[PDB]
Amino acid sequence: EDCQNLLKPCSLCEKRPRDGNIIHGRTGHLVTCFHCARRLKKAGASCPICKKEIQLVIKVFIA
Amino acid sequence: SSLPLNAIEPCVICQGRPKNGCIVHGKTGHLMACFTCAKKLKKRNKPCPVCRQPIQMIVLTYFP
Ligand SMILES: [Zn+2]
Ligand SMILES: [Zn+2]
Ligand SMILES: [Zn+2]
Ligand SMILES: [Zn+2]
DSSP: OTTGGGGSBOTTTSSSBSOEEEEETTEEEEEEOHHHHHHHHHTTOOOTTTOOOOOEEEEEEEO | OOOOGGGGSOOTTTSSSOSOEEEEETTEEEEEEOHHHHHHHHHTTOOOTTTOOOOOEEEEEEOO
16 A cells, blocks of 8 residues: 555655665665665765665556 | 656566666666566676666666
């Protein structure tokens, strides 16, 4: 059920898909586009959800 | 502005759980299987069923 959140636009820019996975260890939060997630990591921001160090930003494609 | 309708479909492998097992290769990820099923694909040393590139890691993904 989470799951329908992925049909919403990016929570930041509100005009791109949620295709930017924010990875920290073996978990990830997918609530932003790739663009916005990249910007957050560049800014040294932590994950907007769990406040963990962003180790990696991945562009996600659904299949 | 939005992901495909596929996103709300369950794991293609087991059809019983959400697509929360992200398959990581480089700076991209394919999201099509649950965590449990995606872990089996990596264990069995199988490539990504979508792009056939090697599976670097599986990330349990939340959407929040
Ligand atoms: Zn965005
Ligand atoms: Zn997080
Ligand atoms: Zn599954
Ligand atoms: Zn792939």
